[PDB]
């Protein structure tokens, strides 16, 4: 039911290098649809889903103008954290940001997000009331206090409930059908020798979208579920995903086992076994 827009931004210190690398990447429903990168020859926000190709040159310039601003924001915060943490210059440091809004089932704002991370650790987050902050540690206090005193939260609150909400609607209108799309898994089972009378039957799911899936091995009243070997879901690199489930098995008694595949795409669940 829900839907969301989110922006992921990173800034990385570069030793001496008067400027740090800055990256921003936007997601609608976990799909990447815009990206801005400091290191580009001519850096600007750049479409990364088909449906962003409509937005005229007015939009890309404004969104680019914004990144220019964020760059400085991060160049400075990055420098302020050095001090909070007693870190010197000539080091590599990372600042990351996650921000955006969630729409509920009945197309109203369900909650807002603004999280920060320093060196890969939670640093500071706006709470759900979008007025008050959670700071991760002592050092985060120095920022919590400063932000409380500036009432910085009011500004994010406005974005989260205003602009964020309205643009998500806008993109969801331009990319509705594209986002709902399914690619159904294509399955098959392989047979590999293992040792004295054991065998490996692995069950492949290939070519599917989105990543979320479920693979199950059964004898009958499907038992074991301790010994099943699993791989994390992996991107084929073409837009599709992959995944596999294996079990170790007595020889001859080969066909009492049955892999089962489950995915939004499927007209019906997949059912298969060796051969």
């Amino acid at each position: 039911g829900p839907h969301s827009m989110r922006y992921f931004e990173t800034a990385v210190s570069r030793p001496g290098l008067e400027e740090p690398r800055y990256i921003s990447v936007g997601y609608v429903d976990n799909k990447e649809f815009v990206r801005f990168d400091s290191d580009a020859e001519n850096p600007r926000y750049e479409p990364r889903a088909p449906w962003m190709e409509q937005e005229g040159p007015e939009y890309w310039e404004r969104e680019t103008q914004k990144a220019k601003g964020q760059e400085q924001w991060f160049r400075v915060s990055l420098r302020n954290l050095l001090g909070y943490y007693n870190q010197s210059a000539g080091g590599s440091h990372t600042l990351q940001q996650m921000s955006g809004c969630d729409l509920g089932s009945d197309w109203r704002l369900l909650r807002g997000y603004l999280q920060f991370a320093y060196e890969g650790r939670d640093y500071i987050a706006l709470n759900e009331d979008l007025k008050t902050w959670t700071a991760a540690d002592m050092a985060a206090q120095i920022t919590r206090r400063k932000w409380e005193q500036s009432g910085a939260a009011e500004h994010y609150k406005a974005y989260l409930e205003g602009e964020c909400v309205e643009w998500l609607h806008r993109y969801l209108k331009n990319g509705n059908a594209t986002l709902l799309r399914t690619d159904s898994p294509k399955a098959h089972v392989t047979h590999h020798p293992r040792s004295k009378g054991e065998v490996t039957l692995r069950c492949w799911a290939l070519g599917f979208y989105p990543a979320d899936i479920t693979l199950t091995w059964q004898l009958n009243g499907e038992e074991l579920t301790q010994d099943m070997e699993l791989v994390e879901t992996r991107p084929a690199g073409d837009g599709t995903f992959q995944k596999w489930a294996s079990v170790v098995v007595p020889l001859g008694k080969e066909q009492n086992y049955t892999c089962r595949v489950y995915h939004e795409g499927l007209p019906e669940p997949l059912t298969l076994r060796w051969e």
């Binding site: 922006y7 914004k66 302020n80 940001q97 500036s150 994010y156 602009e163």
Partner: peptide
């Protein structure tokens, strides 16, 4: 559209 941060850290 992206957001521009306010107060720095």
């Amino acid at each position: 559209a992206s957001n521009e941060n306010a107060e720095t850290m």
